[PDB]
Amino acid sequence: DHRKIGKQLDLYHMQEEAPGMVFWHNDGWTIFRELEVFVRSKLKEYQYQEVKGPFMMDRVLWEKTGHWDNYKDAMFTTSSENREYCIKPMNCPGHVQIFNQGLKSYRDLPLRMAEFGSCHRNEPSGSLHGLMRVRGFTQDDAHIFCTEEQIRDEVNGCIRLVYDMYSTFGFEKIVVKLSTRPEKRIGSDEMWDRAEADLAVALEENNIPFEYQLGEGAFYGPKIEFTLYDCLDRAWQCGTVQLDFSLPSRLSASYVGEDNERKVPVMIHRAILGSMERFIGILTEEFAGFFPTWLAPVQVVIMNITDSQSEYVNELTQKLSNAGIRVKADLRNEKIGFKIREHTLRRVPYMLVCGDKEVESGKVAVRTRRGKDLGSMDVNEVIEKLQQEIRSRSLKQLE
Amino acid sequence: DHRKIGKQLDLYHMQEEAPGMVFWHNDGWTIFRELEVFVRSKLKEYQYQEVKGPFMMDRVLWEKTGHWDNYKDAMFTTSSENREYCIKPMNCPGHVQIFNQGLKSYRDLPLRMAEFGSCHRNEPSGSLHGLMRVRGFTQDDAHIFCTEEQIRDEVNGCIRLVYDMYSTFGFEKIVVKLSTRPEKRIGSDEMWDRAEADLAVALEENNIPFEYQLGEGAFYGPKIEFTLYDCLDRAWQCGTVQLDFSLPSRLSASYVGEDNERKVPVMIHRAILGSMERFIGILTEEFAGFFPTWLAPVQVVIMNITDSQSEYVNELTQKLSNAGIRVKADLRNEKIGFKIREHTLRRVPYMLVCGDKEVESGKVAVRTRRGKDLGSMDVNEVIEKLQQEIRSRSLKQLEE
Numbered sequence: 001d002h003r004k005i006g007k008q009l010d011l012y013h014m015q016e017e018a019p020g021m022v023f024w025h026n027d028g029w030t031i032f033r034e035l036e037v038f039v040r041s042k043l044k045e046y047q048y049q050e051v052k053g054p055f056m057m058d059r060v061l062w063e064k065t066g067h068w069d070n071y072k073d074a075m076f077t078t079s080s081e082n083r084e085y086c087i088k089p090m091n092c093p094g095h096v097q098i099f100n101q102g103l104k105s106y107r108d109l110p111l112r113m114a115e116f117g118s119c120h121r122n123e124p125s126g127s128l129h130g131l132m133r134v135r136g137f138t139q140d141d142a143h144i145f146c147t148e149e150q151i152r153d154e155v156n157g158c159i160r161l162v163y164d165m166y167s168t169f170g171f172e173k174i175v176v177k178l179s180t181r182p183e184k185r186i187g188s189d190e191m192w193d194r195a196e197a198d199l200a201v202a203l204e205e206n207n208i209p210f211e212y213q214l215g216e217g218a219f220y221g222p223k224i225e226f227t228l229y230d231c232l233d234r235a236w237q238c239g240t241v242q243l244d245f246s247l248p249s250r251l252s253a254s255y256v257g258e259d260n261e262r263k264v265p266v267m268i269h270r271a272i273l274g275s276m277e278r279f280i281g282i283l284t285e286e287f288a289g290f291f292p293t294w295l296a297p298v299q300v301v302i303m304n305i306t307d308s309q310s311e312y313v314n315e316l317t318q319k320l321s322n323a324g325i326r327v328k329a330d331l332r333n334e335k336i337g338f339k340i341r342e343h344t345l346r347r348v349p350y351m352l353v354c355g356d357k358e359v360e361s362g363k364v365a366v367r368t369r370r371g372k373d374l375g376s377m378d379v380n381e382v383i384e385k386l387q388q389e390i391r392s393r394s395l396k397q398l399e
Numbered sequence: 400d401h402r403k404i405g406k407q408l409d410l411y412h413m414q415e416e417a418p419g420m421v422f423w424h425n426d427g428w429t430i431f432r433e434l435e436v437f438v439r440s441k442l443k444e445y446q447y448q449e450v451k452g453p454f455m456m457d458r459v460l461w462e463k464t465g466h467w468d469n470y471k472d473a474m475f476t477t478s479s480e481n482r483e484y485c486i487k488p489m490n491c492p493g494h495v496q497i498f499n500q501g502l503k504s505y506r507d508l509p510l511r512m513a514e515f516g517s518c519h520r521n522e523p524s525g526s527l528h529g530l531m532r533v534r535g536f537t538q539d540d541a542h543i544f545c546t547e548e549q550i551r552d553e554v555n556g557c558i559r560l561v562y563d564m565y566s567t568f569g570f571e572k573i574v575v576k577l578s579t580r581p582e583k584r585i586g587s588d589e590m591w592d593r594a595e596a597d598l599a600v601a602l603e604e605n606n607i608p609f610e611y612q613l614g615e616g617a618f619y620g621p622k623i624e625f626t627l628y629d630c631l632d633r634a635w636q637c638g639t640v641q642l643d644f645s646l647p648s649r650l651s652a653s654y655v656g657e658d659n660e661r662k663v664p665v666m667i668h669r670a671i672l673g674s675m676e677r678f679i680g681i682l683t684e685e686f687a688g689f690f691p692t693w694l695a696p697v698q699v700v701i702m703n704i705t706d707s708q709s710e711y712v713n714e715l716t717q718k719l720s721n722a723g724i725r726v727k728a729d730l731r732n733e734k735i736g737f738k739i740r741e742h743t744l745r746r747v748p749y750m751l752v753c754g755d756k757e758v759e760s761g762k763v764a765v766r767t768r769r770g771k772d773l774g775s776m777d778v779n780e781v782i783e784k785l786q787q788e789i790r791s792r793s794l795k796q797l798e799e
């Protein structure tokens with residue numbers, strides 16, 4: 001269970017003073033930040049912008065989207081100077097405002113606009129569960145503005161990017177669902193027939209078996225849902241592709257087409273990891289806290305046996321820190337066996353131990369959180385191989 | 400003016416439906432993210448944790464800080480299930496909540512806890528000005544939890560860090576202020592005297608000339624303010640160092656002393672850049688949009704003369720992109736001087752012109768946004784000198 005592992009590894013905490021809100025401690029914020037770096041490596045490759053929308057906008061804008069009439073109960077509101085404001089439950093409206101700045105043509109499409117966008121949703125407190133269902137979360141979110149003609153390739157690109165990103169983490173059970181029109185929605189039936197059909201088609205062309213969830217899509221679009229399973233095999237919506245012919249209309253999005261007329265862009269919404277919070281929860285149970293090195297909060301701990309090797313440990317720690325390895329020295333006045341056990345429990349991938357023979361040889365005794373003892377290794381060989389394991393984001397280790 | 404250059408460079412925009420709230424466009428968000436990376440390099444060096452606290456906490460917690468009394472008006476509130484939440488105007492209470500998990504000892508201190516902490520403050524709409532005074536901003540915030548013995552060293556560390564980071568931007572007019580007790584405050588006069596004196600001694604010991612700014616401290620502590628000046632030479636508080644003996648106690652912070660007694664830590668507050676929003680407005684006007692290469696949204700633009708050299712531009716654009724450079728191709732059907740003028744308005748450091756002489760030669764013609772021509776040079780030489788000017792965060796271009 002991530003909530004117990006999350007306690008043990010000092011990843012995050014939660015309190016009653018903020019229900020469904022995460023306090024990311026150093027170590028879990030490091031995992032979060034590493035998933036950001038990972039996501040942006042993939043954004044760049046698939047050519048996305050990255051923006052940041054504000055945290056609140058006038059409730060008039062949310063009335064415009066139908067979010068007011070279709071989603072009122074889920075939204076936090078505040079106010080200033082007789083004006084009411086919604087804290088954003090979603091990033092899409094604010095990407096649309098960004099898109100509406102500057103005249104756009106068919107030559108700007110597809111325009112792929114991402115954001116690590118902090119959403120707040122007034123989820124019933126009875127529904128809240130760990131990191132999986134929270135009131136405040138950051139989606140690895142994006143809206144793609146495109147033509148009707150570009151839908152197929154754009155939705156296929158989102159699907160590809162889900163299986164690409166997920167293979168880094170080695171998930172066995174990825175169950176896909178198509179969530180179709182809810183009772184309370186925007187857009188005509190015809191728009192919903194086209195959007196439901198385009199996503200089912202996308203799934204069949206990508207060879208993805210899927211199950212309907214009838215009535216379960218958003219008010220503004222049907223969803224492809226990439227469903228991951230926690231250690232009690234509960235199903236959690238993670239990766240998410242939706243198709244929307246209504247929102248950009250409602251927010252006066254337009255572009256100048258080839259024929260030189262005003263057209264309304266189609267909008268694809270996706271989140272690949274879903275939310276960082278839920279994805280981290282899933283990974284934590286997926287790995288049972290044994291995060292791959294690239295994700296591990298602390299990758300290496302260097303311990304002296306006695307005071308005598310402490311300066312060697314500090315030099316080595318600096319040297320690894322400079323190679324870009326998340327390393328800590330543990331120079332505490334404790335028995336080595338007590339320090340090894342501490343960091344093993346914290347699931348530090350590599351423990352380097354320095355006695356006088358390590359000092360004399362300029363080597364280091366290496367062991368893992370799995371209890372593997374790799375013996376004495378050249379220091380530059382330890383750095384070189386760690387950087388290989390980190391750069392390639394390897395699923396498992398030096399053995 | 401940063402708001403004009405802001406729009407010219409497509410950095411950000413603001414809208415009546417979110418007064419004082421920034422929409423960061425790709426290009427302005429690139430600057431922001433580059434400053435984050437810079438600050439992270441300094442956090443790592445100066446040994447800070449990086450955490451993230453939530454946007455909302457119960458109003459009961461904010462009443463404990465003395466914030467309901469003292470920071471009443473600036474706070475945004477919201478509701479859920481008959482409970483009232485304050486959107487955080489400050490990152491400090493949330494840092495303390497993290498500190499209060501687990502048992503702490505004097506061996507944990509000084510505990511430096513940084514955060515890029517999104518604050519919302521309901522500033523009067525008449526007071527709002529561009530990126531400089533906003534209702535929603537992100538501080539390069541941290542709270543240091545320390546003993547009374549460690550205060551001199553930790554306050555000195557924060558001052559060192561300010562001048563360390565500000566020297567990257569090459570700032571000349573850093574006016575320092577000591578902002579003293581406001582009318583509405585928490586803490587005893589003794590705690591204020593000690594706080595104000597300790598900050599004054601830190602400055603004095605570092606040979607920093609300053610001036611008192613009477614009544615300008617926060618309700619929870621006095622401030623060293625590192626003041627920077629915009630185009631109209633108006634003063635903006637950026638770097639901020641505060642000493643706080645009151646909040647830790649109100650929020651039940653303690654650690655096991657060496658004496659084995661329970662002890663309340665001292666809390667140092669500092670923001671080095673201040674807010675990212677304000678710093679970016681300051682830098683924009685300071686450089687008049689000529690961001691150093693490391694900061695520039697687009698660092699390089701590669702343009703053809705004729706339709707001929709399109710393919711060459713496109714591979715060079717790929718190669719520079721692979722080499723970690725923010726690069727665009729400009730293959731529009733326009734004469735060279737037209738394109739150079741446009742990318743100079745966009746403040747693009749380097750403009751790589753490609754005619755058939757550059758295609759044959761495996762070379763490029765380097766012009767700069769300062770109207771200067773650095774002639775032709777091997778592509779790999781340009782890439783290496785760019786990466787060096789990016790890695791070093793150099794203020795100066797090739798020549799300039």
Ligand SMILES: C[C@H](O)[C@H](N)C(=O)NP(=O)(O)OC[C@@H]1C[C@H](O)[C@H](n2cnc3c(N)ncnc32)O1
Nearest residue numbers: 090132133134137237240269270271274275278
């Ligand atoms: C993406 C697109 O742009 C669109 N706008 C959108 O928002 N879609 P949707 O509402 O399907 O969310 C997508 C993902 C699913 C994942 O589960 C996470 N998520 C949601 N509520 C969550 C909670 N309460 N706790 C944690 N994660 C949560 O966001």
Ligand SMILES: C[C@H](O)[C@H](N)C(=O)NP(=O)(O)OC[C@@H]1C[C@H](O)[C@H](n2cnc3c(N)ncnc32)O1
Nearest residue numbers: 489531532533536636639668669670673674677
């Ligand atoms: C830092 C410490 O931890 C403490 N908690 C704290 O908050 N200090 P303080 O209240 O001095 O603010 C620090 C900086 C100064 C800079 O000016 C920026 N800032 C403030 N209001 C701003 C606005 N409205 N727009 C933009 N930046 C703003 O934050």
Ligand SMILES: [Zn+2]
Nearest residue numbers: 090091092269
């Ligand atoms: Zn969306």
Ligand SMILES: [Zn+2]
Nearest residue numbers: 489490491668
């Ligand atoms: Zn503070």
